[PDB]
Amino acid sequence: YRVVVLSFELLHAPATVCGPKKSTNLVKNKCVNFNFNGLTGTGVLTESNKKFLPFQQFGRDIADTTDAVRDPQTLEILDITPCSFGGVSVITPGTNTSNQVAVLYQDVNCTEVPVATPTWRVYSTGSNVFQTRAGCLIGAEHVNNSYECDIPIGAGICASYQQSIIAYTMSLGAENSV
Amino acid sequence: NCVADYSVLYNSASFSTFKCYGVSPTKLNDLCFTNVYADSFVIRGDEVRQ
Amino acid sequence: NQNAQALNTLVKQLSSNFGAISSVLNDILSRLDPPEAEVQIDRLITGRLQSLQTYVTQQLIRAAEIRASANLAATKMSECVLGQSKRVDFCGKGYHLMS
Amino acid sequence: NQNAQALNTLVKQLSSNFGAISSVLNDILSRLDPPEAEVQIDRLITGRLQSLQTYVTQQLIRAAEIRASANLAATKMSECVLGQSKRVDFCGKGYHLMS
Amino acid sequence: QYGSFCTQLNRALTGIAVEQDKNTQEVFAQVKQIYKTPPIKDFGGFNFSQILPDPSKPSKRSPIEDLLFNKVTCAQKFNGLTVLPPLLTDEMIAQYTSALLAGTITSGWTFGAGPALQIPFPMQMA
Ligand SMILES: *[C@@H]1O[C@H](CO)[C@@H](O)[C@H](O)[C@H]1NC(C)=O
Ligand SMILES: *[C@@H]1O[C@H](CO)[C@@H](O)[C@H](O)[C@H]1NC(C)=O
Ligand SMILES: *[C@@H]1O[C@H](CO)[C@@H](O)[C@H](O)[C@H]1NC(C)=O
């Protein structure tokens, strides 16, 4: 009988031995998955320079999350960065008082919120977006006047109910000089 | 430094159990592996349990 | 320091494979059959969840300790700053006057 | 509320199969032979044991916190009801008279 | 299929976080009103300008607090962990501390047991 065995020894994913017929152009900056030279992953792409050795191939980092991709055809270097993520909190008054609420996302920017049933589309784009260092809460009006701390939000912000939910900086009590 | 082209393996018939995948499940001809060493040899073929 | 070290320990547990073949989420899916790596996923998630439970328990212990320390801080602040205490070595060394 | 929630979570863990085929041991005995039911039951045992261990640890933490609260309550009783205390914010807002 | 361990872990961490928020609120928010030191600084010779906030620096802290904050002092973010901000920032905590300092300097000990009554600092020390 004729038998052939193969060594394999899978330790380095971006190598030179692969011939899939699929070909696609390179993406500069899009929050999309990548499959360059057999290496899979997700994140956003960003171009930068690094003193990489020529004979070497790629660079892996903590938790074996590679931060570099090289084009087999054209010689250039790009860096990767994982996508923005976080929880979403809901700021509500008493359920019997009213039904309207104001969500608060975690440490994310207001730009990518719309990207990430018909009533749910309203909160995506946002008509009263408030940007705060604790998070990007929407649906609550920002008032310059300050009040007592009713609902706890991070970094000295508090939301109350006056027929619309408002968000303000909490006051530390009435001032007085003896 | 070649194209591998493992799709030819599914052709013909007979062969034997692969009994060696040992990575993870999804698609066959995507990963680039590390090194493809072919060491074809001919035995009596009485038992391949070795 | 303890918080940062515990957090670093928690994230280093993703590198260990807990007896599986690989230890990364992308290497969870290459070419073989799901069950073959489903057990592998079972092995991975068991270890990761055990590490997470260990982290949560240690955090609970440390939170209880810090809550006790801060309750002491609150009562000390309220009894030494907001008044003069007759306790011997509760508001310093010697006869306490003000804080 | 915390005690009831922990108890409800502990009992609800029996529904989860922890990677077995069924959460009811009667069906495990009825379908699986004892040589294979031996290895199938192991998952149920380890999962329920893990749930019970987590519950016991959480209850220990809660009992320590409540013991701290009870010690504070006993101290306040002895120092405010059985006498008058000079500690400022230990007997309400203002100078203490009685409790 | 492994159960509901994740809900318990999330609940425990959330409980710890709210515990710390309420904890710092309990430690510092000991007064209902904000007191401020009078513009003229005379207390019989005691020099509190070293201990009170100074208007010159943009950060409303005291020179002891500046050393206390400077003396004591990254790709781990992107695997499923976040750090919530404290309920009240460092500026508000410093404002609470400044109010407490002004209260104990001017009123004495009575600002924590009712209305704050002024009294000269030499007499308070007496
Ligand atoms: C909310 O209002 C309803 C009135 O329909 C009342 O039955 C309920 O007790 C209220 N809940 C609270 C927490 O006040
Ligand atoms: C959010 O994105 C906008 C768009 O460029 C930018 O101006 C803003 O500074 C970003 N927010 C933060 C906190 O950097
Ligand atoms: C409130 O603050 C904003 C932001 O500084 C300012 O544009 C606005 O004029 C202020 N007053 C009112 C009434 O909105």
From Swiss-Prot, chain B:
Phenotype when changing residue 17 to A: In strain: Omicron/BA.2, Omicron/BA.2.12.1, Omicron/BA.4, Omicron/BA.5, Omicron/BQ.1.1, Omicron/XBB.1.5, Omicron/EG.5.1
Chain intervals for the UniProt region annotation (Integrin-binding motif): 44-46
Source organism superkingdom: Viruses
Consequence recorded when altering residue 16 to F: In strain: Omicron/BA.1, Omicron/BA.2, Omicron/BA.2.12.1, Omicron/BA.2.75, Omicron/BA.4, Omicron/BA.5, Omicron/BQ.1.1, Omicron/XBB.1.5, Omicron/EG.5.1
Phenotype for residue 46 to N: In strain: Omicron/BA.2, Omicron/BA.2.12.1, Omicron/BA.2.75, Omicron/BA.4, Omicron/BA.5, Omicron/BQ.1.1, Omicron/XBB.1.5, Omicron/EG.5.1; complete loss of interaction with host integrins
Quaternary structure (record): Binds to host ACE2. RBD also interacts with the N-linked glycan on 'Asn-90' of ACE2. Cleavage of S generates a polybasic C-terminal sequence on S1 that binds to host Neuropilin-1 (NRP1) and Neuropilin-2 (NRP2) receptors. Interacts with host integrin alpha-5/beta-1 (ITGA5:ITGB1) and with ACE2 in complex with integrin alpha-5/beta-1 (ITGA5:ITGB1). May interact via cytoplasmic c-terminus with M protein. May interact (via N-terminus) with host bilirubin and biliverdin, thereby preventing antibody binding to the SARS-CoV-2 spike NTD via an allosteric mechanism.
Role noted for this protein: Attaches the virion to the cell membrane by interacting with host receptor, initiating the infection. The major receptor is host ACE2. When S2/S2' has been cleaved, binding to the receptor triggers direct fusion at the cell membrane. When S2/S2' has not been cleaved, binding to the receptor results in internalization of the virus by endocytosis using host TFRC and GRM2 and leading to fusion of the virion membrane with the host endosomal membrane. Alternatively, may use NRP1/NRP2 and integrin as entry receptors.
UniProt name for this protein: Spike protein S1
Species of provenance: Severe acute respiratory syndrome coronavirus 2 (2019-nCoV)
Recorded name of the encoding gene: S
Full-length numbering of the shown residues: 360 to 409 of 1273
